[PDB]
Symmetry: C6
Subunit: 90 residues, 6 copies
């Protein structure tokens, strides 16, 4: 099951990404990650095509947020088992 | 009901944000979030029109803080059941 | 009861602010807040006129500190009850 | 056996780094380290040639992340017994 | 008695700060504070003239650290009873 | 017993420093310190001459690291007892 994530400069933007993502498709919102410098990441899990739907919707909708910026985004279709317990993507 | 947040550079302005929001309308201050880089967020819940009125008041009144700066603001009208896994 | 706060770039400066504040008037020094980027805030509680006396003395006296800067400052005379338990101003 | 790490600006790229490493060769993802300033590191163990293969794959594939950036990469061939006091 | 602090960019210089302060005069190292952004502070207690002598020694000797930088220094002569709510 | 330390911009570099240090001489590697802005410090303890051997090797070998930088470094030959329990150098 695929993992999708959107990284924002700012917190209100990550919440809108999160919201848009879980409304747009069949994905489980599996938390968010803070790494400093105002960089925050929301992460979801589901079918690869649902996760694409989610990420696209998430990026689009930070245009709605006043002062929002997407810094990065990515999808992995077939994430290796080892990552589940090292990284906070579960 | 909706959720309303204002992010600021600097803590004193975020306290004004919070104070003005909760005084302006029928919303509950439910959240304070720090993400580093001096970026702080204040989060409220209540009817979408009460949330609209509070965020507006918060952004205006931060102009009254010496050294205050708003970085971002946002409202979400019908927040998803499971959005609580990113709120504090 | 009113809340006053002074935000500094730097730690030695926030301690001088804190000291000046609590000497200048009848206020309780109710801790300090760190938010990253070297931004730190001291907070006090008391009568509105005491808090004013305190913040004025606090800002003045970071001139004494070598390398000190005030980044922001603010006072709220009648802070809403809700903020007491969400924000670290108690 | 060796240790292999790739540091990135931004978390999504560091997940790709990890994924690509572990898929490329016979290495075990053993570590994820944050030092602030948006700087994140991913750490693997295994034979030096497997490690070499993994790190190389990780650096290439981060080019495929929208907003991805590699900050630093390194391999240590015969890491000291007591290096575990800085690994996570 | 007074309180003496030296803030530095970088941890190694703050260790020198500390070492020099405590060796220079009759003061006790009571505090080490991190506020992010690489900013670190070292805090001492003792007579105002011992504190004056220590801070001075600390500022001089950081010049001897490769990559050392002082960001700010300060002394408070008669620190308030309740200043301990901001000291570590 | 002397204390030596190397500060890096970046984590992979601090590990190479740490490794080189403990291979080059009789020193105990006594952890590392993070202070923000991507600034990390490795710390060791041993004879003054061993610590010098270690720091020299440490600084040299971050040339091996792709993207590595040393920001600062220092040695104290006879560190004051008071520092042991205030600072994380033990």
């Amino acid at each position: 099951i695929a993992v999708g994530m959107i990284e924002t400069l700012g917190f209100p933007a990550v919440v809108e990404a999160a919201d848009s993502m879980v409304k747009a498709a069949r994905v489980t919102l599996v938390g968010y990650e803070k790494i400093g410098s105002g960089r925050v990441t929301v992460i979801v899990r589901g079918d690869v095509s649902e996760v694409q739907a989610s990420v696209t919707a998430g990026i689009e909708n930070i245009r709605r947020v006043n002062g929002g910026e997407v810094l990065s985004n990515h999808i992995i279709a077939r994430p290796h088992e080892n990552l589940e317990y090292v990284l906070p993507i579960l």
